[PDB]
């Protein structure tokens, strides 16, 4: 990409490894808090032992003040995961995070990792600017903060990432770090006796442990200690280029490059120890050596570009298989809902079939109950009256109206009431087991 000599594995974990040096012993940060590993806070109260206790607790081990790198890495991944969840559950950070590209999302996670979701939610005007792009403007507003004044070097890197959406600030620091000890980050001045391991990581001689073998503190790749050489580029950083002298002929400078052995030699070794194999004088050999190496770099950069494309293809495949799963979950649920719909349609039909029968019989029985009730009312009216008329001592009135009463008594006695006719019954019938087994064995999943 923008590769003057700028390369960067652009993700949140690599981003944070640059911002936070690994400390396998409890240390006090610049606000006096006890922290360990990769930017992990143990305790805020300035306790002598709360820090050790929280260390033992977080690890699950009796940690006097020391964890292993594996333990540090476990804490680190947990802490990154925590920062991300904090963004997602936070009403102010989440909509911003969603709007951002992956580079800028990492810049936002970085802030949360360092300060907490509440502190980052506090940068309201900056968060708004970012959700609206306004990248240059967000960069300026963020540089006005306390964060910036307290940790300007990190803030400048994070702000550049928000502004440009590139990883250049981190590629640049990764490059700067070639000149610093892989372990303690001290600049590799000659006083540090800088050493270059075969895996091209380098360190203060004091930062390496145990012919014999040494495990690289960066990347863990093992080598023989006899194969560790001086980091001659940094060894000379305190003076400029120095003649190097033979390990054996200690007064003779190395002035020849032995192509057959691919290393520098002094005159006495080239004439004696290395007799009959090929060499040039140093300043003659160097031009072709620079061309060979630069050519390999061109080839490796091409392979790198291919791998970057291949990795992007893999991420897309990942999103695809995830989406196939969602497709299947939806297809399954919709298939069942579709069946449920037809079952409810049949349900309504079965009920309407039963209702057709019931309405017929009820129309009849209700008609008859209506008849019986209304005839009964007449009967009670006549009986109530006829008894009242006879309860009366007024024989004149009784005889004067006997005609009207007599008629209604006979009329009620002629009333026709057809008898209560019986009714059929009906029952719902179905095969529970056949349907259960058609469920259970419904479909697949090809």
């Amino acid at each position: 990409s923008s590769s003057e000599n700028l390369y960067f594995q652009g993700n949140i974990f690599e981003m944070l490894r640059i911002d936070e040096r690994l400390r396998l012993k409890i240390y006090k940060d610049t606000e006096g808090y006890y922290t360990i590993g990769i930017g992990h806070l143990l305790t805020k109260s300035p306790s002598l032992n709360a820090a050790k206790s929280e260390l033992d607790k977080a690890i699950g081990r009796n940690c006097n003040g020391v964890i292993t790198k594996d333990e540090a890495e476990k804490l680190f991944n947990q802490d990154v995961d925590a920062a991300v969840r904090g963004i997602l559950r936070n009403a102010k950070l989440k909509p911003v995070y969603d709007s951002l590209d992956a580079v800028r999302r990492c810049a936002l996670i970085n802030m949360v990792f360092q300060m907490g979701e509440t502190g980052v939610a506090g940068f309201t005007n900056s968060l708004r600017m970012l959700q609206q792009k306004r990248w240059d403007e967000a960069a300026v507003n963020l540089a006005k903060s306390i964060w910036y004044n307290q940790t300007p070097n990190r803030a400048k890197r994070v702000i550049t990432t928000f502004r440009t959406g590139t990883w250049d600030a981190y590629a640049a620091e990764a490059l700067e770090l070639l000149e610093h000890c892989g372990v303690c980050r001290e600049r590799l001045r000659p006083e540090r006796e800088p050493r270059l391991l075969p895996c091209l990581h380098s360190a203060c001689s004091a930062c390496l442990g145990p012919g014999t073998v040494v495990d690289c503190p960066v990347c863990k790749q093992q080598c023989f200690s006899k194969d560790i050489v001086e980091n001659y580029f940094m060894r000379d950083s305190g003076s400029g280029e120095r003649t190097v002298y033979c390990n054996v002929h200690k007064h003779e400078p190395l002035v020849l490059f032995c192509e057959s052995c691919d290393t520098l030699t002094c005159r006495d070794c080239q004439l004696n120890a290395h007799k009959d194999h090929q060499y040039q004088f140093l300043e003659d050999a160097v031009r072709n050596q620079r061309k060979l190496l630069a050519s390999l770099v061109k080839r490796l950069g091409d392979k790198h570009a291919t791998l970057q494309k291949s990795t992007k293809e893999v991420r897309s495949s990942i999103r695809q298989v995830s989406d196939v799963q969602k497709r299947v979950q939806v297809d399954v649920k919709m298939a069942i809902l579709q069946i449920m719909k037809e079952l409810n349609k049949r349900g309504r039909v079965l009920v309407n079939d039963a209702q057709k029968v019931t309405e017929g019989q009820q129309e009849r029985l209700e008609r008859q109950h209506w008849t019986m009730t209304k005839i009964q009312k007449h009967q009670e009216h006549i009986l109530r009256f006829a008894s009242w008329a006879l309860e009366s001592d007024n024989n004149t009135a009784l005889l004067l109206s006997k005609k009207l009463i007599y008629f209604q008594l006979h009329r009620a006695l002629k009333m026709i009431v057809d008898p209560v006719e019986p009714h059929g019954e009906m029952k719902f019938q179905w095969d529970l087991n056949a349907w259960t087994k058609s469920a259970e064995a419904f479909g697949k999943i090809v």
Binding site: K326, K333, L337, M340, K341
Partner: protein
């Protein structure tokens, strides 16, 4: 036999995979399953 046994729910990720007819079909059934359970009482 309570509602959960016949209920279907869509996640947000799934919800946005549903078109208009699918969202309505879902309503038809879920509304009707409810009415049948209200009638039945469980």
């Amino acid at each position: 036999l309570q509602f959960r046994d016949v209920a279907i729910e869509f996640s947000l990720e799934e919800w946005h995979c549903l078109d208009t007819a699918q969202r309505n079909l879902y309503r038809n059934v879920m509304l009707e399953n409810y009415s049948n359970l209200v009638f039945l009482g469980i």
